[PDB]
């Protein structure tokens, strides 16, 4: 029938008006198909014929779709969707199963003629007009108007949700503690009552909804236990995903991989192991999708590795507001991180992976901390509190990093958990100049136009060194310099650069990087006992450096 | 009940529409405090639940006005104020008394309660929209509209000015030498009396308000180990930027002088007129860093010159009422904080150093957020407007822990830096 709910007042963006889009007449065939339909649709009271006094209207279309035997009606009000006001987005969030408590029993009540029963604002009813034509240019004009939430109209999704919650309020009042969650056209009643006892309440609800006009076509609380919701396979005790089938073959395009990469991402939710590093990186160079993307042994290896993990259908558990939440982290791969937050000492609640990409030349300790926060954030949203962290990193090591970082950070309660790799600042520069140790004055330049660079150094003993460099920009050689400096120094060394960049990186305490050059600066540093990196304004007259830059530019100038 | 009065028509500054700031996920604990608070505010008629016909939003938060006390609601009217208050600041803009900074002591009285009386334009209520979030997005949130003047909207205190300028009339009459500035529901009262007397003329005024307008000001004092000054006192007069000190060891080891040329170098933009050439000569030769090289005639002359030239500033005191003062903070040491409020690059109107021994309030985020509060409160006293902050903190991390140590009623505009600051020096 029609719900006797309190309507909701809607309007068009100030300055706009009722869409004035006449309908292009289709074949007289569907013209009738429209007649037979609207007729009963009007008989139900959902519509009322009004032709003249409403100038506005929209295009009315009718065709078949998705293996059905009865005609369909496609009246998408997009133009109207453009002139209509904005509403409070029905669902600005994504509910995560992990944040749900297990119920002894649950069901789904299809509320598919949902909108059609909720009456639209007494005024707006006008702006929802559509024109019904006839055959051979003969047609007086059967203009119609909706009395309920239009099939497409922008407000429908919203108004309906706001109207349902009202519909249900009294019910859950006389009979509480029965989790009810409503996604658009799906009602999920859940509780901890025996199959029968439970269904006893469902009826109470159904008839309640029968009172408010929402006739649940489902003669009973009948629905497929393995509920498919947003890729989530749900049950009164566990959750997971399954359609994550990954096909393989020769000549896969950039589009193919991107899709495959996207797939691997979703599964990670519950399957602890998915690594999209190499595959995600191959997508680099966004431009042509149909362009066949080549995978190198590495990329191929990835697919293989993940593929089997997926083979394992790991189940996911729910949450319990009596056991303290825990978050364990493992340092995997190079720039990829994985984590699992759990309640029971062995039952995965939710799993995720932090993909390090924010910046190149990042300290691992920083990475962990980032992942920590990333986890806190995602936790807050889903559950309601911050979890205790099981962290693979020496406590005393943390104390060193935080105290000496320009940024401020915060890590809740977190205890040490010895896993495969330990988070530890590999090397570390000194604070004051080493007494005695040989001082090296590095320097490097490069004619940008010729890509010809030059590196070298000068110790406090007249030990000079210079080596030609090609296809190198000013900065790169600057590093190569400090490199040379490291190559022929001692366990204790002092280096003086002119580069702001060289100091920006090294002092960043980097460890990993897709930069062989930078990597070897780390290699040399990881070996030495004491190293002192110092910076002085270039081209301002500084001990040695002044002159250094001279022997470096011992030829072409830049 | 039926005791309202005519309202003042408020209208969005031409151009913009209602705000729609996405609400940040709040923890369960705080949501409880919010739902409670809100319910009483509905039981009291201060705010009325609203429908979907309103696509507006202003973030809400939960904070404890005092250590170990109850919860306090806090709406983020930064956005709405920008559109709505930026128009109204030229119409009802409450003038700022410079006599406030010149005086000795200053107490900040919370007068928010007052605004809870004057009803707002039944038409403007729409914009004040504020959504309380629910966990896991189970519920799309208990949306709320405001009825009276919310304690966040910069346009509210403007309206309530009417009454306030009266309530104060008497008191001011008997106490002529006490300046009473009013910024965003914060009563900034200043004077020159001996603190002993100050503590009096303040409770006096606190007892006054409570008598005539039933303006109840949350009493505050801490007799504990963390004893804070009585009435939360400030001392504008005790404020000045002098911490910049060059080492007395500038002519010892080459390394030293090297650093010296480091500081003097950058200072070139802050203090036009400084030279370094002479001093550079001393460190010009390829040498070790630990080799001691004493001062030389010309180097010495220019060191002494710059050494002092740093104490007395030059021009820069150009306060452009148009350009918004930008505040920038720099994490220095263990408990030591430093900030600079400039308008144009290197042309600062003031610099300071927040000091909160690391240990008890060890939290970096606690000290930073603490500094964020302190850096502004004064800013209010001296320029009478909130600076734009640049905090050396992770975007996500800040938003997550800032409401936890926050005890303010207003929220300074902030943005997050993600680059190693060269400003991270001895100062
Ligand atoms: C937020 C919520 O409770 C929920 C969200 C989405 C879906 C698809 C179902 C939801 N709850 C149900 C229910 N009927 O209560 C549920 C299922 Br399905 C499985 C386990 C527990 C719960 Br509470």
From Swiss-Prot, chain A:
It catalyses: Endohydrolysis of RNA in RNA/DNA hybrids. Three different cleavage modes: 1. sequence-specific internal cleavage of RNA. Human immunodeficiency virus type 1 and Moloney murine leukemia virus enzymes prefer to cleave the RNA strand one nucleotide away from the RNA-DNA junction. 2. RNA 5'-end directed cleavage 13-19 nucleotides from the RNA end. 3. DNA 3'-end directed cleavage 15-20 nucleotides away from the primer terminus; DNA(n) + a 2'-deoxyribonucleoside 5'-triphosphate = DNA(n+1) + diphosphate. Changing residue 233 to A: Complete loss of RNA-dependent DNA polymerase activity. Complete loss of RNA 5'-end and 3'-end cleavages. Changing residue 110 to A: 5- to 12-fold decrease in affinity for dTTP substrates. Strongly decreased RNA-directed and DNA-directed DNA polymerase activities. No effect on RNase H activity. Loss of pyrophosphorolysis (reverse of the polymerase reaction). The record marks 440-441 as: Cleavage. Mg(2+) 1 binds at residues 110, 185-186. Changing residue 440 to V: Slight delays in replication. Virions contain primarily p51 RT. Mg(2+) 2 binds at residues 443, 478, 498, 549. It comes from the Viruses. Changing residue 406 to L: Decreased RT p66/p51 heterodimerization. Changing residue 156 to A: 74% loss of polymerase activity. 56% loss of RNase H activity. Changing residue 156 to G: Complete loss of polymerase activity. No loss of RNase H activity. The record marks 401, 414 as: Essential for RT p66/p51 heterodimerization. Changing residue 227 to A: No effect on RNA-dependent DNA polymerase activity. Complete loss of RNA 5'-end cleavage. No effect on RNA 3'-end cleavage. Changing residue 279 to S: 21% loss of polymerase activity. 16% loss of RNase H activity. Residues 434-557 form the RNase H type-1 domain. Changing residue 458 to L: In strain: Isolate PV22. Changing residue 232 to A: Complete loss of RNA-dependent DNA polymerase activity. Complete loss of RNA 5'-end and 3'-end cleavages. Changing residue 401 to L: Almost complete loss of RT p66/p51 heterodimerization. Complete loss of polymerase activity. Changing residue 442 to S: Slight delays in replication. Changing residue 501 to A/G/H/L/S/Q: Complete loss of RNAase H activity. It is found in: Virion. Changing residue 167 to L: 80% loss of DNA-directed DNA polymerase activity. 23% loss of RNA-directed DNA polymerase activity. Residues 227-235 are annotated as: RT 'primer grip'. Multifunctional enzyme that converts the viral RNA genome into dsDNA in the cytoplasm, shortly after virus entry into the cell. This enzyme displays a DNA polymerase activity that can copy either DNA or RNA templates, and a ribonuclease H (RNase H) activity that cleaves the RNA strand of RNA-DNA heteroduplexes in a partially processive 3' to 5' endonucleasic mode. Conversion of viral genomic RNA into dsDNA requires many steps. A tRNA(3)-Lys binds to the primer-binding site (PBS) situated at the 5'-end of the viral RNA. This is Reverse transcriptase/ribonuclease H. The lineage of its organism: Viruses, Riboviria, Pararnavirae, Artverviricota, Revtraviricetes.
Swiss-Prot record, chain B:
A motif (Tryptophan repeat motif) lies at residues 398-414. Residues 44-234 form the Reverse transcriptase domain. Transmembrane segments: none annotated. This is p51 RT. Residues 227-235 are annotated as: RT 'primer grip'. The record marks 401, 414 as: Essential for RT p66/p51 heterodimerization. Mg(2+) 1 binds at residues 110, 185-186.
């Amino acid at each position: 029938p029609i719900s006797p709910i309190e309507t909701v007042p809607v309007k068009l963006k100030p300055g706009m008006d009722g869409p004035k889009v006449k309908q292009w007449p289709l074949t007289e065939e569907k013209i009738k198909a429209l007649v037979e339909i609207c007729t009963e649709m009007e008989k139900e009271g959902k519509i009322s014929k009004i032709g003249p006094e409403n100038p506005y209207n929209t295009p009315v279309f009718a065709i078949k779709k998705k293996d059905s035997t009865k005609w369909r009606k496609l009246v998408d009000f997009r133009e109207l969707n453009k002139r209509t006001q904005d509403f409070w987005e029905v669902q600005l969030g994504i509910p995560h199963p992990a944040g749900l408590k297990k119920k002894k029993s649950v069901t789904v009540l299809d509320v598919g003629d949902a909108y059609f029963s909720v009456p639209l604002d007494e005024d707006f009813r006008k702006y929802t007009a559509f024109t019904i034509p006839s055959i051979n240019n003969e047609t007086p004009g059967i203009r119609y108007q909706y009395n309920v939430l239009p099939q497409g109209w922008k407000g429908s999704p919203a108004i309906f949700q706001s109207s349902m919650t009202k519909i249900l309020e009294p019910f859950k009042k006389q009979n509480p503690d029965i989790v009810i969650y409503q996604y658009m056209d799906d009602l999920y009643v859940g509780s901890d009552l025996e199959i029968g006892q439970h269904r006893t309440k469902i009826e109470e609800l159904r008839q309640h909804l029968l009172r408010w006009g929402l006739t649940t076509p489902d003669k009973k609380h009948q629905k497929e236990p393995p509920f498919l919701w947003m890729g989530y396979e749900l049950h009164p005790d566990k959750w997971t995903v399954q359609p994550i089938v990954l096909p393989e073959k020769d000549s896969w395009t950039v589009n193919d991989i991107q899709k495959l990469v996207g797939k691997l991402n979703w599964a990670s939710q519950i399957y602890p192991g998915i690594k999209v590093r190499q595959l995600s990186k191959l997508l680099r160079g966004t431009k042509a999708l149909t362009e066949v993307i080549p995978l190198t042994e590495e990329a191929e290896l990835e697919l293989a590795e993940n593929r089997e993990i997926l083979k394992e259908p790991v189940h996911g558990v729910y949450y319990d507001p009596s056991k303290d939440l825990i978050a364990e982290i493992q340092k995997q791969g190079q720039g990829q991180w994985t984590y699992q937050i759990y309640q029971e000492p062995f039952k995965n609640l939710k799993t995720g992976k932090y993909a390090r990409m924010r910046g190149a030349h990042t300290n691992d300790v920083k990475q962990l901390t980032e992942a920590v926060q990333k986890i806190t954030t995602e936790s807050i949203v889903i559950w309601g509190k911050t979890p205790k962290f099981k962290l693979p990193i020496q406590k005393e090591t943390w104390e060193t990093w935080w105290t000496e970082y320009w940024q401020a950070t915060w890590i809740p309660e977190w205890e040490f958990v010895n896993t495969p790799p330990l988070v530890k600042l590999w090397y570390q520069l000194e604070k004051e100049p080493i007494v005695g140790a040989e001082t090296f004055y590095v320097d490097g330049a490069a004619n940008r136009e010729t890509k010809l660079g030059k590196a070298g150094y000068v110790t406090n003993k007249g030990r000079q060194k210079v080596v030609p460099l090609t296809n190198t920009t000013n900065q790169k050689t600057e590093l190569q310099a400090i490199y040379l400096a490291l190559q022929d120094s001692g366990l204790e060394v002092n280096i003086v650069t002119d580069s702001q960049y060289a100091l920006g990186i090294i002092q960043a305490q980097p460890d990993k990087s897709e930069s062989e050059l930078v990597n070897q600066i780390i290699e040399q540093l990881i070996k030495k006992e004491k190293v002192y990196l110092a910076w002085v304004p270039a081209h301002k007259g500084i001990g040695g450096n002044e002159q250094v830059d001279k022997l470096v530019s011992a030829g072409i100038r830049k | 009940p039926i005791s309202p009065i005519e309202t003042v028509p408020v209208k969005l500054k031409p151009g913009m529409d209602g705000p729609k700031v996405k609400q940040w996920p709040l923890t369960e604990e705080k949501i409880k405090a919010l739902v409670e608070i809100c319910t009483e505010m509905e039981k009291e008629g201060k705010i009325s639940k609203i429908g979907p016909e309103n696509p507006y939003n202003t973030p809400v938060f939960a904070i404890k006005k005092k250590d170990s006390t109850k919860w306090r609601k806090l709406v983020d009217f930064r956005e709405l104020n920008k559109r709505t208050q930026d128009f109204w600041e030229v119409q009802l803009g409450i003038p700022h008394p410079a006599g406030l900074k010149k005086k000795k002591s200053v107490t900040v009285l919370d007068v928010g309660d007052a605004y809870f009386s004057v009803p707002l334009d039944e038409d403007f209520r729409k914009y004040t929209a504020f959504t309380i979030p629910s966990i896991n997005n189970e519920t799309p949130g208990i949306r709320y509209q405001y009825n009276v003047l919310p304690q966040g909207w910069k346009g509210s205190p403007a309206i309530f000015q009417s009454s306030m300028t009266k309530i104060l009339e008497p008191f001011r009459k008997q106490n002529p030498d006490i300046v009473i500035y009013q910024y965003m529901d914060d009563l900034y009262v200043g004077s020159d009396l001996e603190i002993g007397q100050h503590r009096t003329k303040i409770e006096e005024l606190r007892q006054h308000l409570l008598r005539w307008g039933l303006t109840t000001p949350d009493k505050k004092h801490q007799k504990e180990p963390p004893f804070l000054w009585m009435g939360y006192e400030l001392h504008p007069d005790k404020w000045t930027v002098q911490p910049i000190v060059l080492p007395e060891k500038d002519s010892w080891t080459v390394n030293d002088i090297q650093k010296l040329v480091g500081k003097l170098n950058w200072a070139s933009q802050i203090y036009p007129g400084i030279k370094v050439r002479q001093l550079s000569k001393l460190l010009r030769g390829t040498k070790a860093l630990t080799e001691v090289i004493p001062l030389t005639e010309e180097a010495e002359l220019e060191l002494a010159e710059n050494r002092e030239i740093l104490k007395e500033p030059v021009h820069g005191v150009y306060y452009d009422p148009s350009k918004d003062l930008i505040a920038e903070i720099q994490k220095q040491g263990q408990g030591q904080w430093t900030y600079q409020i400039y308008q144009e690059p290197f042309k600062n109107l003031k610099t300071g150093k927040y000091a909160r021994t690391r240990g008890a309030h060890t939290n970096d985020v606690k000290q930073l957020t603490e500094a964020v509060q302190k850096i502004t409160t004064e800013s209010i006293v001296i320029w009478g407007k909130t600076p734009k902050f640049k905090l050396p903190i992770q975007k996500e991390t800040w938003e997550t822990w800032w409401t936890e140590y926050w005890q303010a009623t207003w929220i300074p505009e902030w943005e997050f830096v993600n680059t190693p600051p060269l400003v991270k020096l001895w100062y």
